[PDB]
Amino acid sequence: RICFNHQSSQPQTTKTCSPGESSCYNKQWSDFRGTIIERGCGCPTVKPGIKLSCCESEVCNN
């Protein structure tokens, strides 16, 4: 699996996940400065108030 791993609106970047990993994630929240987007491989545990989306296809998390 290949997932995007770039932050917010930064130029797209990707990363090769570990073998067996089928998911990518999109973690969104707003801090004092508004919306922030984090992306990567897997489907991590997230804090309350954090919007988490997990998808199962190549670079599905933009």
Add this chain to the structure above:
Amino acid sequence: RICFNHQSSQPQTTKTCSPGESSCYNKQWSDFRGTIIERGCGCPTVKPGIKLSCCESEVCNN
């Protein structure tokens, strides 16, 4: 949990999920009509090739 449940490009509609349900899903494939999107509560398994995204926040599955 509230999730969208409208198909493809129809007007947005929502559904209140069963208690105990915290996920919403977006399932996408294609047919003669174009890109088909199914939305709902939960996080189903899909046939290989079908794009699936699951999210854990209100109306997160547009």
